[PDB]
Design an enzyme around this catalytic site. Sequence first.
Site, PDB file in Angstrom:
ATOM      1  N   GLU A  96       0.825  -1.194   0.000  1.00  0.00           N
ATOM      2  CA  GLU A  96       0.000   0.000   0.000  1.00  0.00           C
ATOM      3  C   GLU A  96       0.867   1.255   0.000  1.00  0.00           C
ATOM      4  O   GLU A  96       0.547   2.212  -0.662  1.00  0.00           O
ATOM      5  CB  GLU A  96      -0.938   0.014   1.211  1.00  0.00           C
TER       6      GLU A  96
ATOM      7  N   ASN B 282      -7.692   9.202  -5.635  1.00  0.00           N
ATOM      8  CA  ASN B 282      -8.582   8.285  -6.349  1.00  0.00           C
ATOM      9  C   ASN B 282      -9.352   9.062  -7.418  1.00  0.00           C
ATOM     10  O   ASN B 282      -9.481  10.292  -7.368  1.00  0.00           O
ATOM     11  CB  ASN B 282      -9.532   7.618  -5.379  1.00  0.00           C
TER      12      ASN B 282
ATOM     13  N   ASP C  68     -12.482   9.274  -8.052  1.00  0.00           N
ATOM     14  CA  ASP C  68     -13.660   9.968  -7.543  1.00  0.00           C
ATOM     15  C   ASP C  68     -13.341  11.267  -6.764  1.00  0.00           C
ATOM     16  O   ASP C  68     -14.267  11.923  -6.320  1.00  0.00           O
ATOM     17  CB  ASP C  68     -14.528   9.020  -6.716  1.00  0.00           C
TER      18      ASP C  68
ATOM     19  N   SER D 143     -11.658  11.319  -3.852  1.00  0.00           N
ATOM     20  CA  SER D 143     -11.217  10.939  -2.505  1.00  0.00           C
ATOM     21  C   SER D 143      -9.687  10.686  -2.556  1.00  0.00           C
ATOM     22  O   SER D 143      -9.100  10.641  -3.631  1.00  0.00           O
ATOM     23  CB  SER D 143     -11.957   9.692  -2.037  1.00  0.00           C
TER      24      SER D 143
END
Length: 129
Positions: A35, A46, A48, A50
């Site tokens: 990660e 992201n 979207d 976010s």
Amino acid sequence: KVFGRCELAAAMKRHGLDNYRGYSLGNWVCAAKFESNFNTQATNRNTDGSTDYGILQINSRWWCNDGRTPGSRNLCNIPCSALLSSDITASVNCAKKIVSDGNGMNAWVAWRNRCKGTDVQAWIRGCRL
Ligand SMILES: [Cl-]
Ligand SMILES: [Cl-]
Ligand code: NA
């Protein structure tokens, strides 16, 4: 902060992640590796709008407040910047809530695609824990 592998394993264990919801410590270290590369300051935007924050790339769409994800939730009741600290407490406490949601560690896409089913214990091999 960029944690060493065993340094992060010890911190995650001390904070109660080892075998949390049945996921051994190696699963958590592996997830953090892919990660964030063990970097607490990691961020990724992201599509979207976010953003994912910290060692476990926790998303502002649901779990933290960053003030720039309209209509999002803050289910861990924390500012997203708290997930970037050298102290992993906030990231661990929030990850406990995330893994308790329906899909377990499959919430972490890098865990599902790069850790799940592999020899995850190798991520804590050689560590004194
Ligand atoms: Cl393990
Ligand atoms: Cl927001
Ligand atoms: Na949010």
